[PDB]
Design a protein around this ligand. Structure first.
Ligand SMILES: O=c1[nH]c(-c2cc(O)c3c(O)cc(O)cc3c2)ncc1O
Ligand SMILES: [Cl-]
Ligand SMILES: [Mg+2]
Ligand SMILES: [Mn+2]
Length: 182
């Protein structure tokens, strides 16, 4: 589901490190990036947001968990849980917030945000894990309506997501993409 024009877009739009991390994530499930090109973009976007979110508070307020191999990912997680004694999650989250001492799952959606907020809450079966959704239309939604970052930072993120929708639109990739969301 998608085009080599979408493939080309991904390679032009996203930082090479992000591109390679997504190619690796997909291949680990037997998916081919130059075929399932809508997932390629989807995975790339979720990564970029995660990295943007981490560089949004103070220095080293967040530990990044997404983008890491499973062993290092669980190394970080297991260590944080030892140093802080917070309930160890059953699935790998995306960040840890040292300041509010909780994990964060981050969602990015091309549908309505309330819908994606539940599927996460149900899959993550989040005990103490904080959830935070974003859309490409400027919608956001967080646990107990706690948005963690300041607005200048949250807006830096929403504006980037908007930016991507548009560039996709000009290239006529957006509906396929909006359509293909499982
Ligand atoms: O929140 C997260 N989401 C994802 C994730 C993984 C996928 O494999 C996806 C896919 O194949 C299609 C799709 O439309 C969206 C996808 C999102 N990975 C890590 C997270 O923290
Ligand atoms: Cl990384
Ligand atoms: Mg993740
Ligand atoms: Mn996530």
């Amino acid at each position: 589901s998608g085009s080599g024009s979408m493939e080309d877009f991904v390679r032009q739009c996203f930082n090479p490190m992000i591109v390679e991390l997504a190619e690796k994530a997909m291949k680990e499930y037997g998916e081919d990036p130059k075929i399932e090109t809508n997932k390629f973009a989807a995975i790339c976007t979720h990564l970029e947001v995660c990295f943007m979110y981490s560089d949004g508070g103070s220095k080293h307020r967040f530990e990044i968990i997404e983008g890491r191999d499973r062993i290092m990912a669980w190394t970080v997680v297991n260590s944080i849980c030892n140093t802080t004694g917070v309930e160890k999650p059953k699935f790998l989250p995306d960040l840890y917030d040292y300041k509010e001492n909780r994990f964060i799952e981050i969602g990015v959606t091309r549908r309505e945000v309330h819908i994606y907020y539940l599927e996460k809450a149900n899959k993550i079966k989040s005990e103490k894990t904080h959830i935070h959704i974003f859309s490409f239309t400027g919608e956001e939604m967080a646990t107990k309506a706690d948005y963690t970052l300041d607005e200048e930072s949250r807006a830096r993120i929403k504006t980037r997501l908007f930016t991507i929708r548009q560039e996709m639109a000009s290239r006529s990739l957006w509906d396929s993409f909006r359509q293909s969301e499982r």
